[PDB]
Amino acid sequence: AHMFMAENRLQLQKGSAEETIERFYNRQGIETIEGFQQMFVTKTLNTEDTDEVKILTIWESEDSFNNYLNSDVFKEAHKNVRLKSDDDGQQSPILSNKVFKYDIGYHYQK
Amino acid sequence: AHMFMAENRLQLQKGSAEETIERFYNRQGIETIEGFQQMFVTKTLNTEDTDEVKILTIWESEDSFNNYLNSDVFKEAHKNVRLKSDDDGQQSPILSNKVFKYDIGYHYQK
Ligand code: HEM
Ligand code: HEM
C-alpha cells in the first residue's frame, strides 16, 4: 500500500507567513487522528509577491485523509480559520487555498 | 533551528511516473550524507496530459542541501540521470526539472 500526501497551498499577504505558521504550534487534535503520520508547514523561499505557506500532511492512505476532513477535531481546529474573502474574514491574511493530492511512491527517513 | 525542504518538480511523459519512481528504490549513498533527514517521491494525482513526479528532500539546513549538491555521492547517484532535452537523453521520459525551496516553519511526526 502507498502512503498519501495532501497539500494545502495558502496564498497569503506579503509578510504574513510567520504569524500564520505560528498558528500551527498549538496542537488541536491531529495527534489523535487515525492514519495520520506527519505534517510539514512550509514557507516558500524567494517569493516576490504574496507569501506562500503550504500544509503538507502525510497519511497511511487517502481514506485516512478523507475521514480526517469529516472529524470533530478538524472542525474544531479550523473554527477560527477564515479566508480574507469570508464575510468575517477581512483581518485574515489568507487570500486563497488550493488542494493538491499525491501518491507517495517512495519514502526514506535516515 | 528550522529545517529546509527542496523540491525537484519533474514533468514527465504521460504514463512514465511509476517507472521513474521505481528508480529510487535502491539507495546510492544518501544515508551517508550530513544533514539529510528524509525524502518523499510523489506522483501528482490530476488530469494533466503529462505526469508529475516530485523529489522532496528534507534537510537540517539549506547549507547541508547545497553541500550534497556539490558531493561525489550526488554526482555518482545521478550518473545515468538525463532529461529528454539532453544530447543523450533520448530514453528519458523526464521532460524538465524545476527546483523550489522552502523553510520548514513547523513539523510534527507522530
Ligand atoms: C484538505 C483540507 C485541510 C487539511 C487536511 C488541513 C490540515 C491541517 C492540520 C493537520 C492542522 C493542524 C491541526 C491540529 O493541530 O489539530 C491545520 C491547522 C490549520 N489550518 Fe488546515 N487543513 C485543511 C484546510 C485548511 C484551509 C482551507 C485553511 C485556510 C483557509 C487552513 C488553514 C489552517 C491554519 C491557519 C491552521 C493553524 C491552526 C489555527 O489557525 O487554528 N486549513 N490544518
Ligand atoms: C536539487 C537537486 C537534486 C536533489 C537534492 C536530488 C536528490 C536525490 C536523492 C536524495 C536521490 C536518492 C539518491 C540515493 O539513493 O542516494 C536521488 C535520486 C534520483 N534522482 Fe535526484 N536530486 C536532484 C536532482 C535531480 C534531477 C534534476 C533529476 C532528473 C532530471 C533527478 C532524478 C533522480 C532519479 C531518476 C533518481 C533515482 C536514481 C537513479 O535514477 O539513478 N534528480 N536524487
UniProtKB/Swiss-Prot annotation, chains A, B:
PROSITE patterns: ABM
Enzyme class, UniProt record, top EC level: oxidoreductase
Cellular-component GO terms for this entry: cytoplasm
Protein residues bound to heme: 23-30, 78
Any Pfam family the entry gives: ABM
GO biological process, one term: iron import into cell
Keyword terms: Cytoplasm, Heme, Iron, Metal-binding, Monooxygenase, Oxidoreductase
Subcellular location: Cytoplasm
Keyword hit for Lyase: no
Self-association and partners: Homodimer.
Site (Transition state stabilizer): 68
Protein name (database record): Heme oxygenase (staphylobilin-producing) 2
Gene name in the database record: isdI
Protein's job: Allows bacterial pathogens to use the host heme as an iron source. Catalyzes the oxidative degradation of the heme macrocyclic porphyrin ring to the oxo-bilirubin chromophore staphylobilin (a mixture of the linear tetrapyrroles 5-oxo-delta-bilirubin and 15-oxo-beta-bilirubin) in the presence of a suitable electron donor such as ascorbate or NADPH--cytochrome P450 reductase, with subsequent release of free iron.
Record-linked InterPro entries: ABM_dom, Dimeric_a/b-barrel, Heme-degrading_MO, IsdG
Ligand binding (Fe cation): 8
A molecular function GO annotation: heme binding
Native source organism of the sequence: Staphylococcus aureus (strain N315)
Catalyzed reaction equations: heme b + 5 AH2 + 4 O2 + 2 H(+) = delta-staphylobilin + Fe(2+) + formaldehyde + 5 A + 4 H2O; heme b + 5 AH2 + 4 O2 + 2 H(+) = beta-staphylobilin + Fe(2+) + formaldehyde + 5 A + 4 H2O
Keyword Nucleus: no
Annotated ranges, domain ABM: 4-95
